[PDB]
Amino acid sequence: FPSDMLRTGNNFEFTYTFEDVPFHSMFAHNQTLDRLMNPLVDQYLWAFSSVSQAGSSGRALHYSRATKTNMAAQYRNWLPGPFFRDQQIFTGASNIT
Amino acid sequence: DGVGNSSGNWHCDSQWLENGVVTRTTRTWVLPSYNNHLYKRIQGPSGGDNNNKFFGFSTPWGYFDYNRFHCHFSPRDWQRLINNNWGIRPKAMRFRLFNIQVKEVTVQDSNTTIANNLTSTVQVFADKDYQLPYVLGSATEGTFPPFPADIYTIPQYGYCTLNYNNEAVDRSAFYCLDYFPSDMLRTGNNFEFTYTFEDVPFHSMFAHNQTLDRLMNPLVDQYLWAFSSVSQAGSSGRALHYSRATKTNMAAQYRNWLPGPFFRDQQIFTGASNITKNNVFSVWEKGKQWELDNRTNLMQPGPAAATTFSGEPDRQAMQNTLAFSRTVYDQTTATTDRNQILITNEDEIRPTNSVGIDAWGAVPTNNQSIVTPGTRAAVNNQGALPGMVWQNRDIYLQGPIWAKIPDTDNHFHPSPLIGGFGCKHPPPQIFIKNTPVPANPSETFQTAKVASFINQYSTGQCTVEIFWELKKETSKRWNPEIQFTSNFGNAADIQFAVSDTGSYSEPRPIGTRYLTKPL
Amino acid sequence: KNNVFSVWEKGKQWELDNRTNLMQPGPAAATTFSGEPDRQAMQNTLAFS
Amino acid sequence: RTVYDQTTATTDRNQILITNEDEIRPTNSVGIDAWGAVPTNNQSIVTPGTRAAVNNQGALPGMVWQNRDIYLQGPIWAKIPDTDNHFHPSPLIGGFG
Amino acid sequence: DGVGNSSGNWHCDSQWLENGVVTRTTRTWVLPS
Amino acid sequence: QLPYVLGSATEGTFPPFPADIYTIPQYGYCTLNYNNEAVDRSAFYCLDY
Amino acid sequence: KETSKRWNPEIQFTSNFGNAADIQFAVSDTGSYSEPRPIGTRYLTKPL
Amino acid sequence: YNNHLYKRIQGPSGGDNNNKFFGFSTPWGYFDYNRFHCHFSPRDWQRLI
Amino acid sequence: NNNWGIRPKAMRFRLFNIQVKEVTVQDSNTTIANNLTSTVQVFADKDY
């Protein structure tokens, strides 16, 4: 490569400009991804719920709307990011055993 | 202006343009006084199940949720839309609120008396900077009625924050809506603002003429050789066979493309003959779910997948399909009959998207040899692979229009899994309140808090007007296409109209995808 | 060292609607380990006449 | 906790500084537990439905996630390799790709 | 003006400036006789 | 506006050698189907149109 | 063009054969073009 | 081709649903020049790569 | 957290949306109605 030879009187300098990169997010979130809902109201969306035994050999399909009481079964627009699982350790004085 | 001059008029029409449509609609609303003018702390139920626990606040405020399609479109305008057009997206929006009147309520001797308070105010603001929890994305109640004559009760605003079970973690936030600037409005005053949508992709209102794997020319053969089988040549010998895919054998053939990401779901038997073949179970047990923190949540819509195989309509995926009530007002939260509710069908995405019942594929799980025969396992869930294509769940006349894409470092195809248009900056939330008017004080100074207010509520009209951009069809298809037609034949009541009681009802769900396009 | 089998059985595949299709090229992957040229992936490599 | 320490292995945690990733908990799922569960078979009266946990999950439409945060002691940037294809090129240690 | 026209709006926000801050706040009051 | 059959790698390409002569292949296409019989959404394209 | 304030959807001409060996309004395997059903204009409705 | 007829081609009749298809064949032809050795000679290719 | 010092500079007070209510008590039952023509009087003492 070409280089700059420098004796004691000489100095070297250059400048550089970064390409556009996204801001690193220095904030946390106030909300959980699954709690984005309004807790006071209920959903209007029905969903399949369970199969039951009607009579001896018969069956019945149940549908239910998610209510402010039942958040676990509810419609959501979003999912957590890609995931690759890892093992756990017990990091503390009581758990270390 | 004044008490005797109207603030605005009633605009409910929708007019069609070349490459667009504006649907303006108007309602009459009522605003209760919520929480007796208090911010209260709501919390989840106390128990051992950590999934339904939450921490949040409820506010003495209300909000306009107009986010559904049938608020803006009539069933005819919707039909007129979906038959003639390949795509639709929102462009601009104008909300305005007028003809405010607040009523004062006094109850004495079990007899209520309502008189209008001319000097009382209503205060409204839109959150333009998205500095509040955004609750409109989730599909919940409190939307405008589909029918213009019905009256819209404005829902109460509350939100959830970061929590540890029911109790609150240190990072959880409390938002006071009285700490925003607002517009106080008496009966002469009105409120208005305009909004313009960010660029979002057209929703595809078309199906496909072709299957993803049938893109080939059926008359010719491939020029590409591929490994075929290993055979036994002699006693201990082996021979490797190679073969070109021929127009006869399509299954083993080279292709450039793969179906979209897939997360499998269980099947149910949805029909009179098959209903008996169902095992007894529940979604929470045998269904598909994702989990976050210490909680597990059903993955309710999930990524879109065809709901059933071709020619087998009665065995279909339990998780994917949306379902609606045929009236906005039904109080039943669970039902065992399907005639009461409307069940969507996702089959139009079948060419590109794989069915949710069957697996996505299979993978070799080991290195073969003469000692170990090769093994393989099914692929139930598959993330993104290069060369995937897939369709979004289609929007419905009854479904939600948009959602707010969260503010996060990373997004992957931010299409709302329920449906509609994901937005970085969605339509603002509009908050409305009855300013408190206190009851007479004690005439001597006291330090106690003011708990006594004049009981009152407000009502008025609100117009919402949206410009929708349309993508016209260009098609050389010779033969006619499927289109949405109303066939009930003879009936006591016509479909999509009021009954003799006066109740409006929507008899069947309506999706966009009818017109078709080559793949 | 090869066992007796066929691609349709022991191979990798994806399925669409009621049909199953071999995933013939698939996503690109190195066909063989370093220094082991004679043991290689059956699905990935293209072949020509 | 010092740039100059010569020890390459240690059994005490007071000597070294251990980061905590909990701020991404709302969007990102915890690494210990699985990402979810999938139905593994087609149910019937003959075969009860089965399901299996999802330990690794690639990208699905509608995912959101947070990057590992930068630290005062951590690396600032990395060079995204020259390749035909990248997926969210955020350096997995941290910083700006 | 009139009985049906509001006199003013609600301003409770506080905005930060270089070398300063304005805190505007609003309340509802009651005056006994 | 027509089914695009060129993506799939099939026969009927120009020869590699300029002296050879190129027999033009016949054009045909596949549409949405249920097994062999045709579903309602399948399309017929007339090239004379 | 139509101008209609009708609320509820209208009858329109839709092709429903469901499953079939040949698609309607298209050639057969012999190459013969055929029109399976007649088509009139009147679907949209107007007050009298 | 086809004695100037649009004909309906279809998949083979059997129990295997993988190779079944529905489509049409046209009295038309098309130019498929899509391969590299159509355009490049082996020397031009070497000179390129 | 970010600043060494603070002092006030200017101030603006304003009072609006006045409404006076009239109270009548009869039969241990209070009734409040707004008196449109009644006034409220305000002044600031500038000269201390």
Residue C28 CA to residue C14 CA, distance in Å, equals 16
CA distance to partner chain A, nearest, from residue B443 (Å): 38
CA distance to partner chain B, nearest, from residue C33 (Å): 13
Counting other chains too, the contacts that I21-26 makes at CB distance below 8 Å and 24 or more residues apart are I21/B437, I21/B440, I21/B454, I23/B440
Show the CA angle centred on residue B290, arms to residues B286 and B295, nearest 5°.
100
**Of B416, B382, B392, which Cα lies nearest the Cα of D59?**
B382
Residue B379: C-alpha distances to residues B382, C41, D35, D40 (Å): 7, 20, 16, 9
I16, I18, I34, best to mutate vs chain E, most E CBs in 10 Å: I16
Q: DSSP code of F11?
A: S
Least CB-CB distance to H22: which of F5, F13, F42? F42
Residue B429 CA to residue B180 CA, distance in Å, equals 13
A76, A79, A85, best to mutate vs chain B, most B CBs in 10 Å: A76
The end-to-end CA distance of chain A, in Å, is 58
**Of B131, I3, B183, which Cα lies nearest the Cα of E21?**
I3
* Residue at A72: amino acid letter: A
Name residues whose C-beta falls within 8 Å of residue B177's C-beta, 6 or more positions apart in sequence.
Answer: B59, B61, B132, B157, B431, B433
Residue D35 CA to residue B488 CA, distance in Å, equals 46
CA distance to partner chain B, nearest, from residue G43 (Å): 10
**Cβ contact B178:A82 at 8 Å:** no
Tokens coding F43: 């399309």
Residue E11: C-alpha distances to residues A91, B441, E8, E22 (Å): 50, 25, 9, 12
Tokens coding B238: 């082996």
As a dihedral over the C-alpha atoms of residue G8, residue B416, residue B348, residue G41, rounded to 10 degrees, the angle is: 30
**Cβ contact A50:B281 at 8 Å:** yes
Residue B438 CA to residue B250 CA, distance in Å, equals 79
Name residues whose C-beta falls within 8 Å of residue F48's C-beta, 6 or more positions apart in sequence.
Answer: none
- State the burial class of residue H18 (Cβ atoms within 10 Å of its Cβ: 0-12, 13-18, 19+): buried
Question: Contact H21/B248, CB-based, under 8 Å?
Answer: no
**Cβ contact A85:D56 at 8 Å:** yes
Helix (H) or strand (E) holding F26: strand F26-31
Name residues whose C-beta falls within 8 Å of residue A70's C-beta, 6 or more positions apart in sequence.
Answer: B52
Q: DSSP code of B144?
A: P
Task: Provide the b/e sequence for A20-43 (b: ≥16 CB within 10 Å).
Answer: eeeeebeeebbbbbbbbbbbbbbb
Nearest residue of F to residue H32 by CA position? Answer: F13
**Which residues of chain G make contact with B76, given a CB cutoff of 8 A?**
4, 6-10
Question: How many C-beta atoms surround the C-beta of residue D55 within 10 A?
Answer: 13
User: Given strand B361-364, what is the order of strands in its sheet?
Assistant: B376-379, B361-364, C13-16, C19-22
**Cβ contact B484:B83 at 8 Å:** yes
What subunits touch chain F, counting only 3 or more CB pairs under 8 A? B, G, H
Phi and psi angles of residue F21, each rounded to the nearest 5 degrees, phi first: -110, 145
Nearest residue of I to residue B185 by CA position? Answer: I17
Name residues whose C-beta falls within 8 Å of residue I7's C-beta, 6 or more positions apart in sequence.
Answer: none
**Cβ contact B166:B219 at 8 Å:** no
Tokens coding B475: 């098609």
**Of B64, B54, B311, which Cα lies nearest the Cα of B162?**
B54
As a dihedral over the C-alpha atoms of residue D25, residue D27, residue D28, residue D30, rounded to 10 degrees, the angle is: 40
CA distance to partner chain F, nearest, from residue H46 (Å): 15
Residue D72 CA to residue B262 CA, distance in Å, equals 40
Residue B325 CA to residue F5 CA, distance in Å, equals 44
Question: Contact B179/E5, CB-based, under 8 Å?
Answer: no
Residue B330 CA to residue G23 CA, distance in Å, equals 43
Question: Contact B354/C6, CB-based, under 8 Å?
Answer: no
Question: How many C-beta atoms surround the C-beta of residue G6 within 10 A?
Answer: 15
CA distance to partner chain H, nearest, from residue G47 (Å): 44
As a dihedral over the C-alpha atoms of residue D44, residue D47, residue D48, residue D51, rounded to 10 degrees, the angle is: -110
Residue B350 CA to residue B259 CA, distance in Å, equals 10
Phi and psi angles of residue B243, each rounded to the nearest 5 degrees, phi first: -150, 145
Beta-strand ranges (E) seen in B209-253 are 225-233, 237-244
**Cβ contact B120:B25 at 8 Å:** no
CA distance to partner chain G, nearest, from residue F29 (Å): 14
Tokens coding B230: 């290993």
Question: Contact B485/G10, CB-based, under 8 Å?
Answer: yes
Question: Contact B224/C47, CB-based, under 8 Å?
Answer: yes
Residue B209 CA to residue F45 CA, distance in Å, equals 11
The number of angstroms, rounded, from the C-alpha of B34 to the middle of its chain's C-alpha atoms is: 27
Q: Do chains E and D touch (3 or more CB pairs under 8 A)?
A: no
**Which residues of chain C make contact with H17, given a CB cutoff of 8 A?**
18-19
Nearest residue of A to residue B318 by CA position? Answer: A48
Question: Contact F30/H20, CB-based, under 8 Å?
Answer: no
DSSP letters spanning B288-349: -EEEETTEEEE--S-S--BSB-TT-TTEEETTT--EEESSTT---SEES-TTSEEE---GGG
Structure solved using which method? Answer: cryo-EM
Rg over CA atoms, chain A: 30
**Owner of token pair 């795509």:** B87
Name residues whose C-beta falls within 8 Å of residue G35's C-beta, 6 or more positions apart in sequence.
Answer: G25
Tokens coding H4: 């100037």
Three-state DSSP string of chain D: CCCCCCCCCCCCCCCCCCCCCHHHCCCCCCCCCCCEEEECCCCCCCCCCCEEEECEECCCCCEEECCCCCCCCCCCECCCCCCCCCCCCCCCCCCEC
Question: What's the sign of the alpha-carbon dihedral D55, B303, B312, F42?
Answer: negative
Nearest residue of B to residue C28 by CA position? Answer: B386
Residue B102 CA to residue B459 CA, distance in Å, equals 6
At residue B388, the 3 state secondary structure works out as strand
Residue C42 CA to residue C31 CA, distance in Å, equals 8
DSSP letters spanning B173-215: ----GGGS-BEEE-TT--EEEEEEPPP-PPEE--EESS-TT--
The end-to-end CA distance of chain H, in Å, is 40
Nearest residue of E to residue B444 by CA position? Answer: E32
User: Given strand D36-39, what is the order of strands in its sheet?
Assistant: B295-298, B289-292, D36-39, D51-54
**Cβ contact B257:D20 at 8 Å:** no
Residue A66 CA to residue A72 CA, distance in Å, equals 8
The partner residues of B291 in beta bridges, in order of sequence, read B296
Name residues whose C-beta falls within 8 Å of residue B405's C-beta, 6 or more positions apart in sequence.
Answer: B411, B414, B422, B423, B424, D64
B227, B262, B316, best to mutate vs chain C, most C CBs in 10 Å: B227
In B42-167, alpha helices (H): 69-72, 75-84
Least CB-CB distance to B333: which of A65, A76, A82? A65
Residue B255 CA to residue C27 CA, distance in Å, equals 11
Question: How many C-beta atoms surround the C-beta of residue I3 within 10 A?
Answer: 7
Name residues whose C-beta falls within 8 Å of residue G14's C-beta, 6 or more positions apart in sequence.
Answer: B480, B481, B482, B483, B484, B485
Q: Do chains B and C touch (3 or more CB pairs under 8 A)?
A: yes
What subunits touch chain D, counting only 3 or more CB pairs under 8 A? A, B
Name residues whose C-beta falls within 8 Å of residue A11's C-beta, 6 or more positions apart in sequence.
Answer: none
Q: DSSP code of B148?
A: T
Question: Contact I29/B439, CB-based, under 8 Å?
Answer: no
At residue B63, the 3 state secondary structure works out as strand
**Cβ contact B292:A32 at 8 Å:** yes
Strand B323-325 and strand B341-343: the pairing is: antiparallel
In B30-172, alpha helices (H): 69-72, 75-84
Residue B316 CA to residue A81 CA, distance in Å, equals 28
CA distance to partner chain H, nearest, from residue B219 (Å): 8
**Which residues of chain B make contact with C15, given a CB cutoff of 8 A?**
354, 358-361
